[PDB]
Design an enzyme around this catalytic site. Structure first.
Site, PDB file in Angstrom:
ATOM      1  N   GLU A   1      -8.839  -4.634  -3.068  1.00 37.86           N
ATOM      2  CA  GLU A   1      -9.027  -4.107  -1.746  1.00 37.86           C
ATOM      3  C   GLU A   1      -8.506  -2.703  -1.837  1.00 37.86           C
ATOM      4  OE1 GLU A   1      -6.841  -6.057   1.394  1.00 37.86           O
ATOM      5  OE2 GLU A   1      -7.968  -5.039   3.014  1.00 37.86           O
TER       6      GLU A   1
ATOM      7  N   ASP B   1     -11.346   1.236  -1.103  1.00 35.72           N
ATOM      8  CA  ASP B   1     -10.478   2.360  -0.807  1.00 35.72           C
ATOM      9  C   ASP B   1      -9.206   2.272  -1.610  1.00 35.72           C
ATOM     10  OD1 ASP B   1     -12.015   3.600   1.451  1.00 35.72           O
ATOM     11  OD2 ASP B   1     -11.567   1.626   2.369  1.00 35.72           O
TER      12      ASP B   1
ATOM     13  N   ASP C   1      -5.677   3.883   2.493  1.00 31.96           N
ATOM     14  CA  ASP C   1      -6.184   3.797   3.826  1.00 31.96           C
ATOM     15  C   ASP C   1      -4.949   4.050   4.622  1.00 31.96           C
ATOM     16  OD1 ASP C   1      -8.380   3.216   5.792  1.00 31.96           O
ATOM     17  OD2 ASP C   1      -6.889   1.698   6.438  1.00 31.96           O
TER      18      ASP C   1
END
Lengths: 331, 331
Positions: free
Chosen positions: A24, A57, A60
């Site tokens: 993630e 990403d 973030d």
């Protein structure tokens, strides 16, 4: 961090980090309204954090998802007070690094945000994307990104964001060329590097604070300070000062051109001085009879050629503002 | 730090730190002699430190501010040996971040100091007041400081310092005098930002490191490179090179004009090239009879107007160095 407010202090954050191969993101402040409560984070200190090789990403530091949250955000300032992808978090951001990312390296949203010293490089996908509107940034470096060309940006801004200092271009980037920077609504300054003017699309670009201009030729046998308007075209100069050497190099004699583009061909109309070591001015004239709309300047004359009489004539616009035609040269 | 000398080792300092709401300065080396013995600090290392919301400076790295203007400075070199605001402290200064300062965000004094990577942003008061003399400030970003206009500028330098690179102009800029940088004794090179020349008061402003460059315009229908001397007048140019598009945008033809100031009115006298798609140069002339003090250049000719004749006549200074009046064009 999920629903953390460092309050007045800005207590809580991460100083020093490394993450490899997150599914993630390695460092994240979570976005949107999760359930009926806020996952948004405020007042955190981020320095010296590193996330390398993220699937999506790398960083973030946002707080708002692409789809709008429930109206009048709970635990936060309303959606009416700040539109989507605007809301101050007041995070402090410095010294980030990303290598190789499949996804984006960097991305955030907010308004009133202050950001410095972002580095993303090496990336298969994007280096950078932003959702930010009306935020401030400095010292962004996006190098090499989109190696395998999977988006056509390398850096993107959707905002009215004010930025200074941008340095670009690895060994090989952009997509095969299609805008390093697309941010047509943002005012960006400090854009420099080996980046092309056809890789730049911004709302405004200037850098008027620089002193006396000096141009150094290396890898060139000509020296120029070019002027280009990108509404004219991003591949066509609007004017330039050219200096080209007459004879071989080291001659000590060169001609300086004051040029204006005509027909989409640069140096079509040139006012040259010392052209081929003449020590005079080579002055262009109209190849046909001068028109009344080819002159608008009082106390100036436009030389023109008349093929019929084989004589050089001048269309003189007097300081009276009236036109009179005189014979400028006849043998 | 009260009376700390790291010696040649450069022991002591602050590394990896965050400070919030100090009633003086977050990280402070004390100014001058305070107490019976000296409190002046030498040879400390400040890196990766953050001071958020200081009342005064975030990093006060001085040691020779407002104390002992008299002949002897206790526990320190005399003021005769080194003037006030000059000492060889030799602090190691890199990667410092200041945000939220009510007053000035950064200040220091010293001589022989080498300062790099200072970013001061989002401060109510000024970004830096630099009392240093003969110190080098490299990679400085002062963005969105002095937004309440307590002071008169974003950055001030009292002494003569060498500033290599600068970044100015945030989303708001100063209007407390409208000088973005007032540092009239300092020599600054490489000012980045869309800051106007009139808003820059510096001792010397010049560039000598730039290569062959191209000017890029976005949101403008003209590309302007202006030549300005501020001894002549701060708000008026001494000459300028404008390039404006012939007709509508996207034509691919743009006329380049070379302008000069006359009467204190810019663009009074101009030499236009490719004026309204004519491919000829507009040659200005004196609206009255030419003077012999106007032209003093051998092997050049100055055209002039005579109303009664309605004919161009040119005062020619020959390569013989003697003046002769010949009729340039006949009616």
């Amino acid at each position: 961090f999920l629903r953390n407010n460092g309050g007045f202090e800005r207590d809580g954050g991460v100083i020093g980090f490394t993450s490899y191969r997150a599914g993630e993101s390695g460092v994240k402040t979570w976005q949107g309204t999760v359930g009926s409560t806020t996952s948004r984070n405020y007042n955190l200190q981020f320095r010296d954090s590193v996330v390398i090789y993220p699937v999506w990403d790398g960083f973030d530091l946002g707080a708002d998802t692409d789809m709008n949250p429930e109206l009048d955000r709970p635990g936060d300032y309303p959606i009416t007070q700040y539109p989507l992808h605007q809301l101050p978090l007041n995070h402090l951001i410095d010294n980030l690094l990303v290598r190789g990312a499949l996804g984006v390296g960097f991305g955030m949203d907010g308004k009133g945000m202050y950001v410095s010293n972002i580095t993303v490089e090496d990336c298969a996908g994007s280096g950078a994307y932003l959702l930010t509107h009306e935020s401030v940034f400095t010292n962004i470096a996006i190098i090499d990104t989109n190696t395998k060309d999977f988006q056509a940006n390398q850096i993107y801004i959707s905002g009215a964001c004010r930025v200074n200092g941008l340095r670009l271009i690895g060994i090989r980037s952009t997509d095969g060329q299609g805008l390093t920077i697309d941010a047509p609504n943002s005012t960006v300054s400090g854009i420099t590097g080996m980046v092309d003017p056809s890789r730049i699309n911004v709302a405004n670009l200037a850098e008027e604070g620089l002193g006396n201009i000096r141009a150094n030729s290396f890898g060139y046998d000509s020296a120029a300070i070019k002027l280009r308007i990108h509404k004219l075209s991003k591949t066509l100069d609007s004017g330039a000062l050219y200096s080209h050497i007459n004879g071989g190099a080291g001659s000590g004699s060169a001609y300086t051109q004051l040029t204006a583009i005509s027909g989409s061909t640069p140096d079509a109309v040139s006012l040259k001085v010392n052209h081929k070591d003449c020590r005079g001015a080579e002055i262009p004239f109209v190849p046909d009879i001068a028109s009344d709309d080819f002159i608008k300047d009082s106390s100036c004359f436009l030389p023109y050629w008349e093929n019929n009489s084989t004589s050089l004539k001048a269309l003189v616009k007097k300081p009276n503002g009236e036109l009179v035609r005189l014979t400028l040269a006849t043998l």
